Enzyme design. Structure first.
Site, mmCIF file in Angstrom:
data_model
loop_
_atom_site.group_PDB
_atom_site.id
_atom_site.type_symbol
_atom_site.label_atom_id
_atom_site.label_comp_id
_atom_site.label_asym_id
_atom_site.label_seq_id
_atom_site.Cartn_x
_atom_site.Cartn_y
_atom_site.Cartn_z
ATOM 1 N N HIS A 1 13.661 13.377 -11.905
ATOM 2 C CA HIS A 1 14.333 13.348 -13.210
ATOM 3 C C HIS A 1 15.803 13.670 -13.151
ATOM 4 C CE1 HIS A 1 10.817 12.730 -15.787
ATOM 5 N NE2 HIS A 1 10.215 13.056 -14.639
ATOM 6 N N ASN B 1 13.101 6.444 -20.767
ATOM 7 C CA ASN B 1 12.440 5.743 -19.661
ATOM 8 C C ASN B 1 13.249 6.038 -18.416
ATOM 9 O OD1 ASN B 1 14.767 3.956 -20.222
ATOM 10 N ND2 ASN B 1 13.678 2.250 -19.261
#
EC number: 3.2.2.29
Length: 195
Positions: A44, A33
Site C-alpha cells: 500500500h 483501487n
DNA sequence: CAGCTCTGTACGTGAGCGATGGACAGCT
DNA sequence: GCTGTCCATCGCTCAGTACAGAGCTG
C-alpha cells in the site's frame, strides 16, 4: 520510458493488491483501487505520486517516517489496516466504470461487517460518494470530508472521509494540504479510546 | 421552479527516468 | 591535450477534485 524495472504496464494491470485486515483495529484505510506502483510492489501507497506515508508521519499517527514496506506491521503496532473499494489496477480512478465501483461498495460493506474496525477511513471523496448513495441512500450534492452522520449498518463503525492521498489532485497539492484530515483522524481515534 | 445528478475540464506539487554538461583524473 | 567516467543537474512525465451549468424528475 521504464518506470517499473522492465515490467510492462499491461502485466501490472492484471495484478491485485492484498488486504491487511484483522479484528480489534481502530482504523481501516480504504483506497479507491491500486495504482501501477502498488500493483508492482504488492504493498500500500509506495511513492512517487502518493502522500499517505508522509501525512501518516506529519500528523503524528506514526512516530517515525514509515513507507509501503511497513504496511503489514501497522495492524499490530498502530491498530491500522488496509483495503480498497475496487480490486482492479488502473493508472488513475477515471479509468474505472460505475459498475466496478458499485460492485466494490457491496463487497466493502461485507468486509467491514466482518472486521468492524472503530473507523472506516475513505481515502478519496469519490469512493464515499458512490458508497454513501449505494449503502445509505443519501444525496451526494453537499457531501463533506471528515466525520459522516452514518455508521456502517449492523456495526458501531464510523465513516471518516479524506481527500485522496494521490498527488494527481491539484486542490490539495502537497502532503501538508492533506495533513489536517490525518490530525483530525488521530483526534477522533484518541477520543474513542478516551471515551 | 427546486433539488438533485451528470460530465467535460483545468489545476499545484514533488519524485524519478533518461539525457546532458562541467569537473575531474588517467595516459611511459 | 585528449580521453572517458562521474554525478549533480535538467526537462519531461506522472501520481482526484471542484466547478459550471446544463439535464433529469417530482
Amino acid at each position: 520510458v521504464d518506470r517499473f524495472n522492465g515490467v510492462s504496464e499491461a502485466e501490472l494491470l492484471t495484478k491485485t493488491l492484498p488486504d491487511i485486515l484483522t479484528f480489534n483495529l481502530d482504523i481501516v484505510i480504504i483506497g479507491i483501487n491500486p495504482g501501477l506502483m502498488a500493483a508492482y510492489k504488492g504493498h500500500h501507497y509506495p511513492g512517487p505520486g502518493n502522500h499517505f506515508w508522509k501525512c501518516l508521519f506529519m500528523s503524528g499517527l506514526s512516530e517515525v517516517q514509515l513507507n509501503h514496506m511497513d504496511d503489514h506491521t501497522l495492524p499490530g503496532k498502530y491498530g491500522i489496516g488496509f483495503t480498497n473499494m475496487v480490486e482492479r489496477t488502473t493508472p488513475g480512478s477515471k479509468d474505472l466504470s460505475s459498475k466496478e465501483f458499485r460492485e466494490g461498495g457491496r463487497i466493502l460493506v461485507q468486509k467491514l461487517q466482518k472486521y468492524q474496525p472503530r473507523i472506516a477511513v475513505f481515502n478519496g471523496k469519490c469512493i464515499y460518494e458512490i458508497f454513501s448513495k449505494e449503502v445509505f441512500g443519501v444525496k451526494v450534492k453537499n457531501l463533506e470530508f471528515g466525520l459522516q452522520p452514518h455508521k456502517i449498518p449492523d456495526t458501531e463503525t464510523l465513516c471518516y472521509v479524506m481527500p485522496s492521498s494521490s498527488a494527481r489532485c491539484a486542490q490539495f497539492p502537497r502532503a501538508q494540504d492533506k495533513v489536517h484530515y490525518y490530525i483530525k483522524l488521530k483526534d477522533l481515534r484518541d477520543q474513542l479510546k478516551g471515551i
